[PDB]
Design a binder for these strands. Structure first.
Length: 488
DNA sequence: TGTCCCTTTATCTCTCT
RNA sequence: GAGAGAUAAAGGGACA
């Protein structure tokens, strides 16, 4: 707190310049999350970390420092990164990721120790081991995978990949041990498949979710009239214990006082933060359907996404100013709000609507179309930045830019165009329309990436097709479409 | 003190249809 | 429209 800021101010000047050049947000973050020690450690080793053999970026260092025990993780990286890159074939990016969590020292040491056994004896890839390690308590998860992977596969009939999926969240050790304990009970008493069991276990707090399913399954079914498929769907997100308990508590209330169906209730609870969306519907539905004039159908549709609560509140706060100061319609506002991160999207529209219409000459329908996707906020911001860049450098039309941005991951598709259009046109003879067309579905980024990988390093199975055929195939079904044909 | 481990909520991207 | 994945943040606990 006070000591942390003390150390920070004393040092701020130096690391604000070479070799780190940390902005103030980076300085506060390290102080707040890594503490005095992390602040001092970063200042001490600021040279060792930015240079050979390590060559870490400022971002990378900040990210390792900004945790409980940052000094230790920073110490451990400097020591073990070469060995893990040299003698285990891991990338520096991977070493950093293992490091960037509470207890990063343990995870790094445990990986060095257990990666050989986990790969050579349990048939795991290094990527898989890295994924298990890349969370709080990774040491525990890796050790528990080492102990329990074979019994979970040999006796319970899970696959390695299911086991890795259960291990690869925080509390992975807890989730795995619970599955071992509860899988037979939950299958052979409540009637669940091991797939359903894995699904519930494969999010953070899985142990809690599993235990709550055992406890509450009979009640939700034999009393509230829900099916086990529905209970599983509620439980199959992070905080699934919170969502289950909340369905039990609020399902009658929500149906009877606000007129919703179980169907709609289950839909609201079946998302990360489901407990929050439920309680926010119960508290926000009146105001919305009355003072604002929304239907319950519309309110349900807004709440039935990850972080539904945030969308709901932002709609209530912005439904006026949007419908009367930018001339949007409530149906549009609903459409924007009805995706994960709806709040972020709504706020970004309000801020960038006049700029995109009045400066770049877009229509408000085009803005709504860009905003009505997951990551709507990202897509809008990247249009603002990359629209002039793409029109001026490559002659893309604003229509084409809109098209690329109006899917999920539109930010990625847009950036991948900026990066890959020159090599695809110049060095491979694609036309911009072709490039745009490939980027004009979802998975624009990976489709474009898949295309350039083939063009610059052909797999034989694909070398039988002309560039045009490849383009047509990329336009047909993106990266999955290229992979399907390689597999022939 | 500092370090390590567990849980819940928000946001973003890919695939299918 | 739906499903799946992923990253992060916040909270909490433990130990000394």
């Amino acid at each position: 707190g006070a000591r942390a800021l003390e150390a920070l101010l004393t040092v701020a000047g130096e690391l604000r310049g070479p070799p780190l050049q940390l902005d103030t947000g980076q300085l506060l973050k390290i102080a707040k999350r890594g503490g005095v020690t992390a602040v001092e450690a970063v200042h001490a080793w600021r040279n060792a970390l930015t240079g050979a053999p390590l060559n870490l970026t400022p971002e990378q260092v900040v990210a390792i420092a900004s945790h409980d025990g940052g000094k230790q993780a920073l110490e451990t990286v400097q020591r073990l990164l070469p060995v893990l890159c040299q003698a285990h074939g891991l990338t520096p990016q991977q070493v950093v990721a293992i490091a960037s969590h509470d207890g990063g020292k343990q995870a790094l040491e445990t990986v060095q120790r257990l990666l050989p056994v986990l790969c050579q004896a349990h048939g795991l890839t290094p990527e898989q081991v890295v994924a298990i390690a890349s969370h709080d308590g990774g040491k525990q998860a890796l050790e528990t995978v080492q102990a329990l992977l074979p019994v979970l596969c040999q006796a319970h009939g899970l696959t390695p990949e299911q086991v890795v999926a259960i291990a690869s969240n925080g509390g992975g050790k807890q989730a795995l041990e619970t599955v071992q304990r509860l899988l037979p009970v939950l299958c052979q008493a409540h009637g669940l498949t091991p797939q359903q069991v894995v699904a519930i276990a494969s999010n953070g707090g899985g142990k809690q979710a599993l235990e709550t399913v055992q406890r509450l399954l009979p009640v939700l079914c034999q009393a509230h009239g829900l099916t086990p498929q529905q209970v599983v769907a509620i439980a199959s997100n992070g905080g699934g214990k919170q969502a289950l308990e909340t369905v039990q508590r609020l399902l009658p209330v929500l149906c009877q006082a606000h007129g919703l169906t179980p169907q709609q209730v289950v839909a609201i609870a079946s998302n990360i933060g489901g407990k929050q969306a439920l309680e926010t519907v119960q508290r926000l539905l009146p105001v919305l359907c009355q003072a604002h004039g929304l239907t319950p159908q519309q309110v349900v549709a807004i709440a039935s996404n990850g972080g539904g609560k945030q969308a709901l509140e932002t709609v209530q706060r912005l439904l006026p100013v949007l419908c009367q100061a930018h001339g949007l319609t409530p149906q549009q506002v609903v459409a924007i709000a009805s995706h994960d991160g709806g709040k972020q999207a709504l706020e970004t529209v309000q801020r960038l609507l006049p700029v995109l219409c009045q400066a770049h000459g877009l229509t408000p329908e085009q803005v709504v179309a860009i905003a009505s996707n997951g990551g709507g906020k990202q897509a809008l911001e990247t249009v603002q930045r990359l629209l002039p860049v793409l029109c001026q450098a490559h002659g893309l039309t604003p229509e084409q830019v809109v098209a690329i941005a109006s899917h999920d991951g539109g930010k990625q598709a847009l950036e991948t165009v900026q990066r890959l259009l020159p090599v695809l046109c110049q060095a491979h003879g694609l036309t911009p329309q072709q490039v745009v067309a490939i980027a004009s579905n979802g998975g624009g980024r990976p489709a474009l990436e898949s295309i350039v990988a083939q063009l610059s390093r052909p797999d034989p199975a694909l070398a039988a097709l002309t560039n045009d055929h490849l383009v047509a195939l990329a336009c047909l079904g993106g990266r999955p479409a290229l992979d399907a044909v390689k597999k022939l």
